[PDB]
Structure formats: C-alpha cells, structure tokens
Amino acid sequence: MIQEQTMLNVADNSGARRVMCIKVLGGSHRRYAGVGDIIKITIKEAIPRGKVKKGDVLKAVVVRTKKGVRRPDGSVIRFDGNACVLLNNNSEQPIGTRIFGPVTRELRSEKFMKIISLAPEVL
Amino acid sequence: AVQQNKPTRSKRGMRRSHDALTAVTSLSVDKTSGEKHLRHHITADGYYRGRKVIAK
Amino acid sequence: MRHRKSGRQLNRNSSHRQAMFRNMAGSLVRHEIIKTTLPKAKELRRVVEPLITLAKTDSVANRRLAFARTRDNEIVAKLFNELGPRFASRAGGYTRILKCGFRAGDNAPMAYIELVDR
Amino acid sequence: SNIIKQLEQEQMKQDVPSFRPGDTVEVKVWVVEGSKKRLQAFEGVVIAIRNRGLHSAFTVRKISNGEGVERVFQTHSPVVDSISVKRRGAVRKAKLYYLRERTGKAARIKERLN
Amino acid sequence: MIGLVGKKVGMTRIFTEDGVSIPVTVIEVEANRVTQVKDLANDGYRAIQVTTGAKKANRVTKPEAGHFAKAGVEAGRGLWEFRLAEGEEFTVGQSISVELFADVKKVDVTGTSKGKGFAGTVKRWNFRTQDATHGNSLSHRVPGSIGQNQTPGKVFKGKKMAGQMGNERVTVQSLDVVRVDAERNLLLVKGAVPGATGSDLIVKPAVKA
Amino acid sequence: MKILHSAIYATGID
RNA sequence: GAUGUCGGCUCAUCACAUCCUGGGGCUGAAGUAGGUCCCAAGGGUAUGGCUGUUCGCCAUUUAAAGUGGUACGCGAGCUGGGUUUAGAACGUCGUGAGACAGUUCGGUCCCUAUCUGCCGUGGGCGCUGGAGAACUGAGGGGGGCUGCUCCUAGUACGAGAGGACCGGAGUGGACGCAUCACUGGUGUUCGGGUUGUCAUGCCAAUGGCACUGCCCGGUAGCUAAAUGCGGAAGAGAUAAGUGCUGAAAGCAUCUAAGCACGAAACUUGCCCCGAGAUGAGUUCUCCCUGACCCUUUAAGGGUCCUGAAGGAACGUUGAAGACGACGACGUUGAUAGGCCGGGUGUGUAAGCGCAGCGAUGCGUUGAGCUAACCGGUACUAAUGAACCGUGAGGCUUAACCU
RNA sequence: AAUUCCUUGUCGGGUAAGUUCCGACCUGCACGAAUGGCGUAAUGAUGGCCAGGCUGUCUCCACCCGAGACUCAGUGAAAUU
RNA sequence: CACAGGUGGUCAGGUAGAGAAUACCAAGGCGCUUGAGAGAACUCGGGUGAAGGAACUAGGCAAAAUGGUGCCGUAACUUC
RNA sequence: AGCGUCGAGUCGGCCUGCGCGGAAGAU
RNA sequence: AGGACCGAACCGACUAAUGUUGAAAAAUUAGCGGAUGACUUGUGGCUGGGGGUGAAAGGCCAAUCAAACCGGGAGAUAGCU
Numbered sequence A: 001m002i003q004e005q006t007m008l009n010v011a012d013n014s015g016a017r018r019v020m021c022i023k024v025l026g027g028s029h030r031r032y033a034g035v036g037d038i039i040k041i042t043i044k045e046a047i048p049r050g051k052v053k054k055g056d057v058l059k060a061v062v063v064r065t066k067k068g069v070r071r072p073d074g075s076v077i078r079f080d081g082n083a084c085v086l087l088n089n090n091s092e093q094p095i096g097t098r099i100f101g102p103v104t105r106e107l108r109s110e111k112f113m114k115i116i117s118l119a120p121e122v123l
Numbered sequence B: 001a002v003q004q005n006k007p008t009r010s011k012r013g014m015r016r017s018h019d020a021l022t023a024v025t026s027l028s029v030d031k032t033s034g035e036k037h038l039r040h041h042i043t044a045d046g047y048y049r050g051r052k053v054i055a056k
Numbered sequence C: 001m002r003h004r005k006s007g008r009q010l011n012r013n014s015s016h017r018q019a020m021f022r023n024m025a026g027s028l029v030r031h032e033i034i035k036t037t038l039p040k041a042k043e044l045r046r047v048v049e050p051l052i053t054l055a056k057t058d059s060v061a062n063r064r065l066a067f068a069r070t071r072d073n074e075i076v077a078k079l080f081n082e083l084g085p086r087f088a089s090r091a092g093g094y095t096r097i098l099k100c101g102f103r104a105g106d107n108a109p110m111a112y113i114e115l116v117d118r
Numbered sequence D: 001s002n003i004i005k006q007l008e009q010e011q012m013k014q015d016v017p018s019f020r021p022g023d024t025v026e027v028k029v030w031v032v033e034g035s036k037k038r039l040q041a042f043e044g045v046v047i048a049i050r051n052r053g054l055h056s057a058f059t060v061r062k063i064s065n066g067e068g069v070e071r072v073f074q075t076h077s078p079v080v081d082s083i084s085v086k087r088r089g090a091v092r093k094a095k096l097y098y099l100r101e102r103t104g105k106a107a108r109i110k111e112r113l114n
Numbered sequence E: 001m002i003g004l005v006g007k008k009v010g011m012t013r014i015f016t017e018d019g020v021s022i023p024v025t026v027i028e029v030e031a032n033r034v035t036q037v038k039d040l041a042n043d044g045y046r047a048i049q050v051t052t053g054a055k056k057a058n059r060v061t062k063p064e065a066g067h068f069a070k071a072g073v074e075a076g077r078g079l080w081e082f083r084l085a086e087g088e089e090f091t092v093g094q095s096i097s098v099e100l101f102a103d104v105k106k107v108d109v110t111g112t113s114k115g116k117g118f119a120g121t122v123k124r125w126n127f128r129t130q131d132a133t134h135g136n137s138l139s140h141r142v143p144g145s146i147g148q149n150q151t152p153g154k155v156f157k158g159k160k161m162a163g164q165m166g167n168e169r170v171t172v173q174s175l176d177v178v179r180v181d182a183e184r185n186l187l188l189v190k191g192a193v194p195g196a197t198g199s200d201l202i203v204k205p206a207v208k209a
Numbered sequence F: 001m002k003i004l005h006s007a008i009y010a011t012g013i014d
Numbered sequence G: 001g002a003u004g005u006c007g008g009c010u011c012a013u014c015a016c017a018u019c020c021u022g023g024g025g026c027u028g029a030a031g032u033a034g035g036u037c038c039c040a041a042g043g044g045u046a047u048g049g050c051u052g053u054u055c056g057c058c059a060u061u062u063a064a065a066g067u068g069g070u071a072c073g074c075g076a077g078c079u080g081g082g083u084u085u086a087g088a089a090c091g092u093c094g095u096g097a098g099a100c101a102g103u104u105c106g107g108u109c110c111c112u113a114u115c116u117g118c119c120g121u122g123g124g125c126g127c128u129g130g131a132g133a134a135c136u137g138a139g140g141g142g143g144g145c146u147g148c149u150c151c152u153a154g155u156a157c158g159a160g161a162g163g164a165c166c167g168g169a170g171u172g173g174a175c176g177c178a179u180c181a182c183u184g185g186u187g188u189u190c191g192g193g194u195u196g197u198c199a200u201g202c203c204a205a206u207g208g209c210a211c212u213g214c215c216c217g218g219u220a221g222c223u224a225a226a227u228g229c230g231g232a233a234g235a236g237a238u239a240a241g242u243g244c245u246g247a248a249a250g251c252a253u254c255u256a257a258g259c260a261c262g263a264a265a266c267u268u269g270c271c272c273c274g275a276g277a278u279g280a281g282u283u284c285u286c287c288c289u290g291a292c293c294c295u296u297u298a299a300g301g302g303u304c305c306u307g308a309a310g311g312a313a314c315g316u317u318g319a320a321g322a323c324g325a326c327g328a329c330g331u332u333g334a335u336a337g338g339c340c341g342g343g344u345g346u347g348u349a350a351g352c353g354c355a356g357c358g359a360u361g362c363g364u365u366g367a368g369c370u371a372a373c374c375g376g377u378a379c380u381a382a383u384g385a386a387c388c389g390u391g392a393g394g395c396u397u398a399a400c401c402u
Numbered sequence H: 001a002a003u004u005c006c007u008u009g010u011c012g013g014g015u016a017a018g019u020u021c022c023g024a025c026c027u028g029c030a031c032g033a034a035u036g037g038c039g040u041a042a043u044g045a046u047g048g049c050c051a052g053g054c055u056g057u058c059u060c061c062a063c064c065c066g067a068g069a070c071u072c073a074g075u076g077a078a079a080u081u
Numbered sequence I: 001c002a003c004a005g006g007u008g009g010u011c012a013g014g015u016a017g018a019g020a021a022u023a024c025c026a027a028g029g030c031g032c033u034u035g036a037g038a039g040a041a042c043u044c045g046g047g048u049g050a051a052g053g054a055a056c057u058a059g060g061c062a063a064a065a066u067g068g069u070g071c072c073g074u075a076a077c078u079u080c
Numbered sequence J: 001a002g003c004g005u006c007g008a009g010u011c012g013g014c015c016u017g018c019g020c021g022g023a024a025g026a027u
Numbered sequence K: 001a002g003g004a005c006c007g008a009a010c011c012g013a014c015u016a017a018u019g020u021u022g023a024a025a026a027a028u029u030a031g032c033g034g035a036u037g038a039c040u041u042g043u044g045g046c047u048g049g050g051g052g053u054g055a056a057a058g059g060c061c062a063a064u065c066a067a068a069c070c071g072g073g074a075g076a077u078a079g080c081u
C-alpha cells in the first residue's frame, strides 16, 4: 500500500539507502502499489560510493510492505517496513547484485526471477 | 428566509387539517371492581385484572 | 443505526446512568415497590434481577461483588438474607412492572415496579 | 446457527496442539512452488490467538534476515500441515503487541517451567 | 427458467484441498409447494405461484386459508411467482426441492438489503466531504451547490440528495454454486447476498451466464 | 470587512 | 428606495466545432506507426513544484488528460489568498494636503425556508358491496469505461530492421452494488494494569473523582483498507460507407421499381420503481341471504334486530425506523426481559495456606468476571373484552340458459 | 531591494519539478549618506523560505461518547407580507 | 431581564505539591426554574483509528507532538 | 450510343417558373 | 543589582472555533503576552467643544466624535424624491 510521498528502504546493494515514491505506475488515478508493483522513485539518501546518486529518478519494485500480502487461504504476511528494489529506468532490471532481507511469493514471475534467485529467503 | 406574500386562512386550515386529535377508542372494564381504565393500565382505585396490585 | 444493540442512553452519560441505576436498585430492594418512568423500570429489570441471582448463593466473594455493585451494606445484607432465600426456587422473573398512567408535571409514562413475591 | 455449526465442525482439524501466547512454535506450510510441493518451516513467538472455532487464527512473529515478519495462520487451513510447540513462554497478556517495539535483550520472554 | 425461495442462514468458509478458502453463504431452501399455475387463457401469461415455510393457524386469515385449501397444500409464510419458460410445466400441489440447482453453475440471488435509514449525501452517493479546517464554517458533510444561478433557475429531477438508503430490492448476479446439499436442504453459493440473517432470498439460474 | 450602519457588511461592487 | 465580484472547494447539467474508445473514404497507405476528411455524445476524460492566480512553464503518469454554454454555472452551499475602506512604509509625482492601471506588511463574509424546484416518507378520498393476497405492464429511472499479457504468429508484410488484420483466453486500473466469512478500525455498555486523593471504622478488598484520570486488550453492531459481483453476449432498424440487379439515357449507373450489408449512437436485451396508467387493469380466495313504518314515493328517509370477513386500537418488540409507515408475536404464546448451558473476551479473582525481614512469589486455578452472541426455558410482561367495518350490492343494451 | 515596469532579468544552490527563498552580476524605469547610508550580538504573539519529529490537513474517511436537531406535555417570538 | 459580562478590601484547613498552580476532600454552600422519550441526516464539543505522513492549503490554519528534577554535555556568532 | 455494323432522332448553348446541396450550440 | 528569567493572582488581547433575531449592542472555550515596573488598582480632585487630552490611531471626551450633548434662531434652505 505505497502511494506518492511514501518513503521506502532499498533491499539491494545499489548504493541507495532511502527512496521516495513519486508516482504509482500502472493506470490512471491509481492510488496504491503493493508487493510486485513497479513505482517511480527518487533517491533521497545514498552511500558515498555507489552505482546510483542522490536525486536520481528511477523505477523500483516493492518487495516488502507493512500492509502485507494476502494468501488464498486468508493468511497475511506483514513486515516491519516498506522495502523496494531499484530497477533500470528502461530495461526494468535490478541494478544491484544482492538482495537484503526476505521476499514473498508474489515476485515469482518471469520478470523478477533474478530477484527471486538473489533473495536470501522467499516466504 | 421569509415569505414574500401573506399566507391565507385557507392555506392555514389546509396545513392544520392534520393537527386533529384522536380520542381513545375504548376503555377496559375491570372485572372485580368494574371501573373503567386504559387497557394494560391499573385502575384509579389500584386494581389490575381483578387484583388489587397497589393500595390506593 | 443501532442494529442489534441494547441499552438506553436516557439522555445521560455512563457515570450518571450507573449512579442512577445503583440508587434505584437500592431503593427497589429497600421498599419492594417503587414508582418511576416506564423506560427506567425496563432498564432497572436488567440490573436488579442479576443482583438477586447473585444473592441466591451466599459467599464472601458474592457479598463483596454485591457490595461493589451496590455500595450499600444494608442492601447487600437484605439481598443475601431475605430476597435470596425468597427467590431461591424462582428463576428469572423476580420483578413485575405495572403501568400506572402519566405524570402531572410532564406527560411522562409512569409505572410501578415491585417484587413478584410481595 | 445449528446448520452453520455443523458445516463448520465437519471441517475442523482434530490434531491441533494446545499453545498459548508467548510460546515459540514452528509451523509447516505447503509451498506448492511450481510443479513440486514441499514443506517450509516458520518458527517464532505467538503474539495473538483468535479462537473463533473454524475461523480461528494465530499470529507468529519472527526476526528473519534482520527483518521482522508477522504471519497470521488460519488454524484449520489445509495449507498448514503441522504446528509444534518448541518452547513455552510466561506472559500475562493474551496479546503481545508490545514486542513489536523491542529487539534483543528487551524481546526475551521468560520460560514457563510449571 | 424458474427459481426457488429460501432463507439466509449466514456466512461461513469452505476449505479446498489446495488450500483455497471460499467465503460461502448458507441458504436454507426447503420444499416449495405450488399453489397456483397460470396460463395464457385465464391469466394471459405462464407462471407458477409457490409457497414455503409454515405459518400460524391463528394468524392465517380466512381468504388465505381458503386459497391454500383450494391449492391443496399447507399454508406457508408467503407467496411468490416464477415465470415459466417454453416447454416447462408444473402441477398444483407439486413440491420442488433444492435439487433443481444440481446442474446449475451460476445463480442470481435477489433479496432486501439492510436498511440504513435516512442517510446523508456522503454515505448515500459517495460525495466528498469538504475541508475540515482552513476556515470552514458549519459546512463539512453538506452537499454543496445543487444548481445554477439561472438557466434553468431550478433543480433537476434525480438530483443526488439525502434520504432513505437500503431496505430495497437488490439482485446480485452470477454467483458460483459451491454446493447443493439435498439432504439438509442447503444451497452454498460463493460470495455475499443482500439482506440480513433470516431474510427471504430468491435464487434463480443466471441469465447473463 | 467594513460594517456599514444597520449592521450590514460592505460588499458593494466597486 | 442594492442583481456580491477573480480564484479555490463541493455539486453538477447541456452542445458537438470528438481528446480516447467505435465505424469508414482517400493517402506521397509494404507492415507497425501516421496525415486528412466523414459518421458517431454511450461511457471515460491525471497527480505534484512555482505562483492568489484562470492561464502558463516544469516533473512524472494515462487510452485520453477535449473545446465551449450554463449571471465569464454554483458565497440565503463553504473559503477569503487577489482586487476595492479606515493603519504604516518604499520608489515616484506635487510647495502641500495627498495620489499612483506601482509595490509591501495587517485588516468582522448575517439570515430559524413562506411559495416554486428537488431528495425521502405519510394522511384523505377515489377506482361503484366489502375484505386478504399474488400479478400484468402504459410509463420512468439506473448501468454502458478501459489498460496490459499470451495463443493464432515471429505468421501476413518487409531487402533487412521491424512486424500484423480477423478471432480466442487470462489478469489489472477507475467506477458502482452488496456483505461481514477472512484481514483490520471502532467498540466511554466486557476484563485487566497503574498514579493522586476521598470514602466504606480499621487490614484486606472495593467504590467516587481526576478527558473513559492514563493506558493495555476486546464481544456484538457499524464499517474499509477486506471480498463477492457488474459493464456483456444476442436481436431489430439505421448513420458514414460498401454492394447486387436495373432503366430513365440501346452504354454507364448502389436507386428511380426491388434486394443484401453496415457503429460504444436509437429500440430491446441486464437491474430497480411502477394501475392516482382517473384509460384507476388481471387472477385466486373469504364474508354478509331479517322485520316494520313514513314520504317531498326514489340510486329516499326512519325504527327494532343483527355486527360477518377484515381492519383499527392496546401491549411485548425488530438486523424496520426522525414521526408515520413496514415486519414478528400476544397464554392454543419464545415477542422482549430475566434464568440455565455454551461460546467470546480478559487473564490464574476473593478467601486460605506456604516461602521470604519485606516488597513479593507459589498452590488452590486457565481461576474469577464476562455487553449486544448462540441453543433452550413460561419465571415476568404481553387480559377476558370493547371499537370501526353490515345485512346480497344502480340503469340501459346485447348474448346465452330458462 | 519593503525601492526593478520590462521581469518568472541572467548565473549558481536548494527540489523529480521552485513566478517564492538564499548567494552573486549591475542594464539603479525611479538607492544613497541625520525627511540619515551601510553593518550589527541580544530581543519580537513581526514578514518570507527550508529541515527533523508529529500527526484525520489530506489520500478517504470509519466508529464511538455527549449537547441540539426528531416525538410527547406546558409556555410561547421574529424578520417579511 | 431572576442577563455565561463588570465590581475594591479582609480570612486562608488536610493529603500530594516549590507554590495562593493543580487533583481529591474538610467547614460551608450548591445541582445553575421546563421536563419525559427516541437514539435519522446534519450542526456543536470531544475520544480512537489500518497503510502513507503536509501529498491539504494562499499559508502546517487547526490538530497532533514536546513538557519535571538531578547529572553529563552543548555550535556559528558576540556589544563577552 | 454500343461492338464496318447499327436502324430514329441526337448534341450542346441561351432566356426562364418552381425545386436540391452549401446549412454546426448549448434546460 | 537588573524597565533581568520561568510562572499564579492582577493587567492585556496574538490565533482559531462558536455565536452573530447571541448567554453578551464586542462575549465564551482552547491556546497567547507582561507579570518590581515607562506596572496595576481603590477614593477624591483638575483640564470643556474649534475646546480639552492624546508614548499620535483623527484616537478618546457617558454604547454618539474630521468638531459631544441639550435648548433656541427654526417651519434654516432644498432648481431634488
């Protein structure tokens, strides 16, 4: 449940540390983005030497949310923070080579198989 | 907001046509005492359905 | 909307309602018959009869619960000494409501609420 | 009432172990990842139990990879395979939501010996 | 074709072998007894009148008692009608069970929605509330403007305002038939249906499916 | 906002 | 002898000179993507930074972010940032008081709705004996949006790059209707922790107050952020357009005689209201089968007897409700309260015993308490009655039976 | 610039995006030295801009507690015409 | 006006508290001259709220938030 | 006119009466 | 010691909401400023209308102020309604 102005933490070694959602992509008047939804983000904080720099406009996919995801049986998996993985603006592929923290099965798609493989745990 | 013209006694009576009161349809009679009373209400003397429920 | 809800506000807040019902329960236990407005009697039915059900069994814990709910040692003693044994066989209907017309100062529907064994 | 009671009691598991909030439990769930079907283990402290019969659920909190994850399992759901109580905890509340702001020595729960 | 009249029992869940939980509504559809069959000659159209349930003898009025006596069936809690499709015929006194939906995949459920009473514009028509601060004066959930300064100089018919909400006939279409328990006279359908517990529902085969 | 005599606000066209 | 203005918010409504979706002609139209013109108003038709701004520029989206009218729609619906009172200052003008299509700081927005209009809900009478139900449908309203992926197919086309039409599935955004099974919110009517103080003689245990004193959880109900469903398929008649046959005009020609197609536009099909539809409709069932007297002697009045079906009234009430209205019951009774059992929530009550100098811990004990929940129970309250409502229901003309 | 019409002057910083803000340039329509010029610590219910925390200000509202609104009994106005 | 306004001096209990603040009480005084019901929209005064956190707005208006004592520690600038 | 053939009219210009298109707006 | 600091009484009135036929012809609630001084307050006295007083707003001078109120000139005058 990520809208505009929402701050997220990066779950990859792309150099960023904190990003802000500036647009929820995927339709007109679309309000929220859950796990597995591409968003347009800007970089607020970054490590001194990394692949990305502060003030860059990129795309990202949300991997963890406090709202959580719901399973067909009615189960819900809630995390303690909102995390996303930075993606290339054109190819929409991960920038870093590592993923920090667990992810969910909602990313089990042909597009994010790299994230699934690099993730430590998939719960 | 206020009226632009004075309403008539005809309109006043038409509005008041729904203000008529309704009288009581019937009054129950106690079996033991025989006094008239409202249904499901005790009598003035203190009787209800042939029993002196209260004193006076 | 008040679907499937119980309890009369009676134009009062919770503390005033609780204090008024405590006083009215004490008066009803003391006098075995009281005259009051019909909604007040209907709401009293739901707080006086559980007190007699509690007083049916005599114990220190029950006496302390009755004291916490009534704040009158005379009322607690009467409940656990007379009303308890009197209603020991009876289950449920310890009170009766008799509608007695309307009040004079205001057109308030009045009624008498008493004990069935009186 | 009786109809729904029968319809729900004809679907309830009879092998559910007895656990209390503050107890460490491990739950086996069917991943069904791709064609294969395997069992995944989720171990953590129970912080909330909702006892509504067939609609019963329980919340388990686990610190995984430096991130706190809370998962709510339906007790009678077929996806849940087994629940095992690894450790018993001593708490005085039905809900342990205060553990969401504690980590490390502050999140420790005394064991219920007897 | 024709449908059946049942009672809403409540909502529950069904767990499938693959872990999916289906929210279902329990509908108690007992035997419906045919009281009158209408034809194109006497009535001008083809439909069947049915009754279900039981009613107190001291409250069944004499005209209704005579109608049920002519029908030959026991008095129920009401009377409903279903139009007959071509090639469909029923006899007076015939009993129809929940087995009619044995092969039906999707149904339409008609009921009376729960009454909200007098509701405001925000609740009834999803109107946006005005600002709660920044100087707003006694205008928070008010509708706002309802017309134009002139031309037409009036309010149009059908203007969205406050009024009675709910307590009206509502139909939900294309609900999956989860289960048809003939022994218990039960129909389990996926989703939610209008009304509260104990309300009368009319379940028909889907028309848009 | 200026208030004229007779307690009426001065909202005249200018 | 007064028609409140710019912008913003809420709520809209109409036109088509159409932004997207839809259907076609031409193309300097190979395909994809375009340009122009014609038809088409059913639906839809962004969020932010700056600025009082409309506008505009910029960032990022979308199928699209249309153009206009409606007192440049809308202040007896809100705001008051701008422009227009009184204060003060800068630049400039004047000797000055003072003044600038100049900037800057600050600066009271009243109205209980009579009529029309609109949103809901009732009373009266009528519909031609009265009453209880179920319907038909003249008419009216609601809804109609669209993205992406896959198959056909890397096929048609194309030197390559690139890349289809038609057709068929899946999954989304926005909107709308329901509902509380799940996930949550609330839950001052349930349980517990705790601070200060007062009181019940005192210890213990409780209660009042301090925002529910502060909090921690939480039943039912309501509810969204939660989960079910929907936009249709089909039919008829057509717009632009495309045709067959065919003369006027031996040819030609979609047309003048005929015939076949043709769109989210129209009428249906889907949902809801609906016989005050005074043109007041249809079907089923139930009830009333006395006497006498006057007359201005007829659709007349009066008296005695009779009071049916049904309704109204009263009481207990509802997931019905502002009040009416609507629904379930009234002893041949589960309508409400209480009571019993269970469930839920909270969390191991009080008393007693033991250990410790004590705070405190342990056992009895998952104890005690437990609202609106579930299944039962006639203990309490739903009284016998009385009231309204009648006694076979007009004339004429036809068709049958007699 | 409390002064600049052109003007949202030009460059830089801050923001994804800044007609406001800050630092400069000087092309000062129309600054300027007691109707004082330029600085200035502290002070200000003073004007403008930014950041952390905070939140129903908002996305987008939901529920609850009270006082009216609603019904009953009593008393009983006003503008306007 | 039997009107949420204004009006000088004097007295100064207990517990907690720095205190004449504040909360609860004592002596003393009072429940404020219409009541009774129900628990719609809407208005007023409040409580709570998932995820986000100024995206609202002319403007963080209003709300929310901080808040005591003791100790450690505290920058540019400065008229010290 | 049609494809030498063909077997009754044909080709246009002028003046005129009445007609058609050009012709889209907001309750 | 301080026209020193925080903060009650006391003195003011910066913001918002309510009210605006009000409880009130300027108030209530929640916040807000000063609070040993150029402070505040009780009683009595003085300054009178082209005059008074004014840390200056054309502010105040009995709910009235770019010339108070009362009586008179006076039935001012009104090419206006």
Ligand SMILES: [K+]
Pocket (backbone or CB within 6 Å): G041
């Ligand atoms: K359109």
Ligand SMILES: [K+]
Pocket (backbone or CB within 6 Å): none
């Ligand atoms: K007007």
Ligand SMILES: [K+]
Pocket (backbone or CB within 6 Å): none
């Ligand atoms: K709930």
Ligand SMILES: [K+]
Pocket (backbone or CB within 6 Å): none
């Ligand atoms: K104990």
Ligand SMILES: [K+]
Pocket (backbone or CB within 6 Å): G091, H003, H030
């Ligand atoms: K200048």
Ligand SMILES: [K+]
Pocket (backbone or CB within 6 Å): none
């Ligand atoms: K100087």
Ligand SMILES: [K+]
Pocket (backbone or CB within 6 Å): H044, H046
């Ligand atoms: K100041």
Ligand SMILES: [K+]
Pocket (backbone or CB within 6 Å): none
């Ligand atoms: K102060």
Ligand SMILES: [K+]
Pocket (backbone or CB within 6 Å): K049, K050, K067
């Ligand atoms: K003078």
Ligand SMILES: [Mg+2]
Pocket (backbone or CB within 6 Å): B015, B016, B018, B019
């Ligand atoms: Mg009246």
Ligand SMILES: [Mg+2]
Pocket (backbone or CB within 6 Å): C004, C005, C006
């Ligand atoms: Mg109830």
Ligand SMILES: [Mg+2]
Pocket (backbone or CB within 6 Å): C011
């Ligand atoms: Mg009242």
Ligand SMILES: [Mg+2]
Pocket (backbone or CB within 6 Å): C015
């Ligand atoms: Mg209290």
Ligand SMILES: [Mg+2]
Pocket (backbone or CB within 6 Å): C003, E114, E115, E116, E117, G320
């Ligand atoms: Mg309702």
Ligand SMILES: [Mg+2]
Pocket (backbone or CB within 6 Å): E128, E129, E130
């Ligand atoms: Mg809004």
Ligand SMILES: [Mg+2]
Pocket (backbone or CB within 6 Å): E137
């Ligand atoms: Mg106001």
